[PDB]
Design a protein around this motif. Structure first.
Motif, mmCIF file in Angstrom:
data_model
loop_
_atom_site.group_PDB
_atom_site.id
_atom_site.type_symbol
_atom_site.label_atom_id
_atom_site.label_comp_id
_atom_site.label_asym_id
_atom_site.label_seq_id
_atom_site.Cartn_x
_atom_site.Cartn_y
_atom_site.Cartn_z
ATOM 1 N N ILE A 39 64.942 47.407 23.530
ATOM 2 C CA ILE A 39 65.327 48.785 23.878
ATOM 3 C C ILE A 39 66.821 49.008 23.635
ATOM 4 C CG2 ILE A 39 63.388 48.901 25.515
ATOM 5 C CD1 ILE A 39 65.359 48.846 27.843
ATOM 6 N N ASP A 40 67.185 50.225 23.231
ATOM 7 C CA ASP A 40 68.574 50.632 23.067
ATOM 8 C C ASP A 40 69.162 51.207 24.352
ATOM 9 O OD1 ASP A 40 66.811 52.715 22.954
ATOM 10 O OD2 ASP A 40 67.781 53.767 21.291
ATOM 11 N N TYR A 41 68.406 51.182 25.450
ATOM 12 C CA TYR A 41 68.853 51.719 26.735
ATOM 13 C C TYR A 41 69.207 53.202 26.632
ATOM 14 C CZ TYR A 41 69.045 46.815 28.082
ATOM 15 O OH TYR A 41 68.727 45.501 28.340
ATOM 16 N N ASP A 42 68.537 53.979 25.771
ATOM 17 C CA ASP A 42 68.863 55.390 25.468
ATOM 18 C C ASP A 42 70.271 55.649 24.867
ATOM 19 O OD1 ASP A 42 67.965 58.209 25.384
ATOM 20 O OD2 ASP A 42 69.216 58.554 27.146
ATOM 21 N N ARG A 43 71.060 54.627 24.508
ATOM 22 C CA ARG A 43 72.376 54.860 23.888
ATOM 23 C C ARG A 43 72.267 55.306 22.427
ATOM 24 N NH1 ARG A 43 78.170 51.511 24.796
ATOM 25 N NH2 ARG A 43 79.364 53.198 24.002
ATOM 26 N N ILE A 44 71.351 54.697 21.665
ATOM 27 C CA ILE A 44 71.241 54.880 20.206
ATOM 28 C C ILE A 44 70.204 55.955 19.829
ATOM 29 C CG2 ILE A 44 70.933 53.713 17.969
ATOM 30 C CD1 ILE A 44 71.910 51.108 19.299
ATOM 31 N N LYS A 45 69.020 55.994 20.468
ATOM 32 C CA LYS A 45 68.065 57.071 20.243
ATOM 33 C C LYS A 45 68.622 58.390 20.759
ATOM 34 C CE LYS A 45 63.254 58.424 21.082
ATOM 35 N NZ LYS A 45 61.979 58.079 21.768
ATOM 36 N N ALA A 46 68.402 59.450 19.991
ATOM 37 C CA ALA A 46 68.873 60.780 20.363
ATOM 38 C C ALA A 46 67.814 61.516 21.174
ATOM 39 C CB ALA A 46 69.243 61.574 19.121
ATOM 40 N N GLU A 55 71.833 47.494 35.216
ATOM 41 C CA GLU A 55 73.073 48.247 35.373
ATOM 42 C C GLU A 55 73.354 49.117 34.155
ATOM 43 O OE1 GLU A 55 74.903 48.372 38.097
ATOM 44 O OE2 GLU A 55 76.361 49.751 37.214
ATOM 45 N N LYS A 56 73.107 48.586 32.956
ATOM 46 C CA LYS A 56 73.352 49.352 31.736
ATOM 47 C C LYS A 56 72.469 50.593 31.674
ATOM 48 C CE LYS A 56 73.513 48.892 26.691
ATOM 49 N NZ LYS A 56 73.315 47.973 25.535
ATOM 50 N N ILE A 57 71.178 50.439 31.964
ATOM 51 C CA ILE A 57 70.272 51.579 31.860
ATOM 52 C C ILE A 57 70.515 52.562 32.993
ATOM 53 C CG2 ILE A 57 68.323 50.745 33.240
ATOM 54 C CD1 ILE A 57 66.572 51.617 30.729
ATOM 55 N N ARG A 58 71.037 52.087 34.124
ATOM 56 C CA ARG A 58 71.389 53.003 35.205
ATOM 57 C C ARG A 58 72.655 53.780 34.870
ATOM 58 N NH1 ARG A 58 69.273 48.817 38.874
ATOM 59 N NH2 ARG A 58 71.352 47.863 38.856
ATOM 60 N N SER A 59 73.633 53.122 34.242
ATOM 61 C CA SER A 59 74.845 53.825 33.832
ATOM 62 C C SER A 59 74.552 54.830 32.722
ATOM 63 C CB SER A 59 75.902 52.822 33.376
ATOM 64 O OG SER A 59 77.052 53.483 32.880
ATOM 65 N N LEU A 60 73.675 54.472 31.782
ATOM 66 C CA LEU A 60 73.332 55.394 30.707
ATOM 67 C C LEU A 60 72.623 56.634 31.234
ATOM 68 C CD1 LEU A 60 73.754 55.350 27.602
ATOM 69 C CD2 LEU A 60 74.266 53.194 28.761
ATOM 70 N N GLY A 61 71.908 56.508 32.349
ATOM 71 C CA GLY A 61 71.244 57.657 32.935
ATOM 72 C C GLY A 61 69.904 57.944 32.274
ATOM 73 N N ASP A 69 65.021 44.957 42.101
ATOM 74 C CA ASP A 69 64.862 44.303 40.809
ATOM 75 C C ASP A 69 63.912 45.070 39.901
ATOM 76 O OD1 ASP A 69 66.612 42.163 41.213
ATOM 77 O OD2 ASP A 69 65.076 40.979 42.238
ATOM 78 N N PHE A 70 63.037 45.895 40.468
ATOM 79 C CA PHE A 70 62.078 46.666 39.693
ATOM 80 C C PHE A 70 62.712 47.970 39.225
ATOM 81 C CE2 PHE A 70 58.041 49.048 39.067
ATOM 82 C CZ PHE A 70 57.427 48.144 38.224
ATOM 83 N N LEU A 71 62.362 48.392 38.012
ATOM 84 C CA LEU A 71 62.876 49.633 37.452
ATOM 85 C C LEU A 71 61.797 50.314 36.628
ATOM 86 C CD1 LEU A 71 65.538 47.508 37.444
ATOM 87 C CD2 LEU A 71 66.610 49.558 36.459
ATOM 88 N N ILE A 72 61.769 51.641 36.695
ATOM 89 C CA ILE A 72 60.895 52.470 35.872
ATOM 90 C C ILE A 72 61.779 53.328 34.978
ATOM 91 C CG2 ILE A 72 58.961 54.074 35.856
ATOM 92 C CD1 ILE A 72 59.786 52.623 39.168
ATOM 93 N N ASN A 76 57.305 55.447 32.223
ATOM 94 C CA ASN A 76 56.602 54.385 32.957
ATOM 95 C C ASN A 76 56.794 52.960 32.391
ATOM 96 O OD1 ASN A 76 55.787 56.468 34.776
ATOM 97 N ND2 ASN A 76 53.855 56.757 33.783
ATOM 98 N N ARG A 77 57.895 52.677 31.683
ATOM 99 C CA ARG A 77 58.240 51.302 31.256
ATOM 100 C C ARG A 77 58.722 50.546 32.490
ATOM 101 N NH1 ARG A 77 56.261 50.533 25.841
ATOM 102 N NH2 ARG A 77 56.484 52.549 24.935
ATOM 103 N N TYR A 78 58.033 49.464 32.841
ATOM 104 C CA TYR A 78 58.319 48.693 34.042
ATOM 105 C C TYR A 78 59.109 47.443 33.679
ATOM 106 C CZ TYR A 78 54.898 51.590 36.536
ATOM 107 O OH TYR A 78 54.215 52.640 37.104
ATOM 108 N N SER A 79 60.179 47.188 34.429
ATOM 109 C CA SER A 79 60.992 45.998 34.251
ATOM 110 C C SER A 79 61.289 45.375 35.606
ATOM 111 C CB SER A 79 62.317 46.321 33.547
ATOM 112 O OG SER A 79 63.062 45.141 33.305
ATOM 113 N N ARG A 80 61.539 44.068 35.592
ATOM 114 C CA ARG A 80 61.835 43.342 36.819
ATOM 115 C C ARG A 80 62.615 42.083 36.479
ATOM 116 N NH1 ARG A 80 56.753 41.489 40.225
ATOM 117 N NH2 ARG A 80 56.833 39.770 38.715
ATOM 118 N N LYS A 81 63.780 41.924 37.105
ATOM 119 C CA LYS A 81 64.600 40.725 36.939
ATOM 120 C C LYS A 81 64.917 40.457 35.468
ATOM 121 C CE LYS A 81 62.971 38.490 41.168
ATOM 122 N NZ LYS A 81 64.250 38.635 41.914
ATOM 123 N N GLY A 82 65.225 41.516 34.725
ATOM 124 C CA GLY A 82 65.551 41.387 33.322
ATOM 125 C C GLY A 82 64.367 41.260 32.388
#
Ligand code: ZN
Lengths: 108, 116
Positions: A39-46, A55-61, A69-72, A76-82
């Motif tokens: 994933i580009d963490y929404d930085r590169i896709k427009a 932290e990166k995906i939270r800062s990108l918004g 540790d869980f993130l959506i 609905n992409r699920y992540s946990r502990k990296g």
């Protein structure tokens, strides 16, 4: 198909990537798969496999939500502990000929 | 009685006890044509999920339960005419199995598929 085994997604950005069979659904419709995100963490896709940076995906918004540790994120992409822990169809993965090399074994 | 056959191919389930194949809506509305007296599956979606499994092999149309060799092979010669799968994979909850045994209904698995 076994628990904690390894499969490969047939399509998507994670196509031909080794994914651990984290959980097997009793209904035999889907399986929960462990993956290293691409994933580009929404930085590169427009992308290569990289540890999920909460932290990166939270800062990108954008489309993000953390429970700890869980993130959506990003539909609905699920992540946990990296590591991504997402359900995928049993027809959408190949269940034979997959074995982790040592790098994949270290990864998962 | 068309109530024992599906109206469409979506969300089909097979009764784990008698291999009857109906839409989940049919199971919710009119229950199992051969097990509702022992299960009471009418009007309970959760119980329908518990007793009927969406996953099965094959389809068999059954017309003459008393005059069919396939009825004997499938042990369905005492059931109502309907759409019957060849193999139904799954198992009932233990509580329901014990309830059937207490009533006097022996539970035999319909998964006749050869494993390995
Ligand atoms: Zn039934």
């Amino acid at each position: 198909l076994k628990p904690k085994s390894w499969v490969r997604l047939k399509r998507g950005i994670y196509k031909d990537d080794i994914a651990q069979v984290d959980y097997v659904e009793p209904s035999q419709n889907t399986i929960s798969l462990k993956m290293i995100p691409r994933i580009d963490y929404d930085r590169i896709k427009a992308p290569p496999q990289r540890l999920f940076d909460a932290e990166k995906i939270r800062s990108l918004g954008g489309d993000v939500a953390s429970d700890g540790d869980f993130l959506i994120f990003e539909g609905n992409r699920y992540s946990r502990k990296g590591f991504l822990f997402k359900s995928f169809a049993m027809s959408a993965v190949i269940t034979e000929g997959v074995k982790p090399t040592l790098s994949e074994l270290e990864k998962f | 009685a068309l109530e024992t056959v599906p109206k469409d191919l979506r969300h089909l389930r097979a009764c784990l006890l008698c291999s009857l194949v109906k839409t989940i809506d049919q199971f919710e509305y009119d229950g199992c044509d051969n097990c509702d007296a022992y299960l009471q599956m009418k009007g309970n979606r959760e119980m329908v999920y518990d007793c009927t499994s969406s996953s099965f092999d094959g389809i068999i149309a059954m017309m003459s339960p008393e005059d069919s060799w396939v009825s004997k092979w499938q042990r369905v010669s005492n059931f109502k005419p309907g759409v019957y799968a060849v193999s139904v994979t799954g198992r009932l909850p233990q509580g329901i199995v014990r309830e059937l045994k207490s009533r006097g209904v022996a539970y035999k698995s319909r998964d006749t598929a050869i494993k390995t």
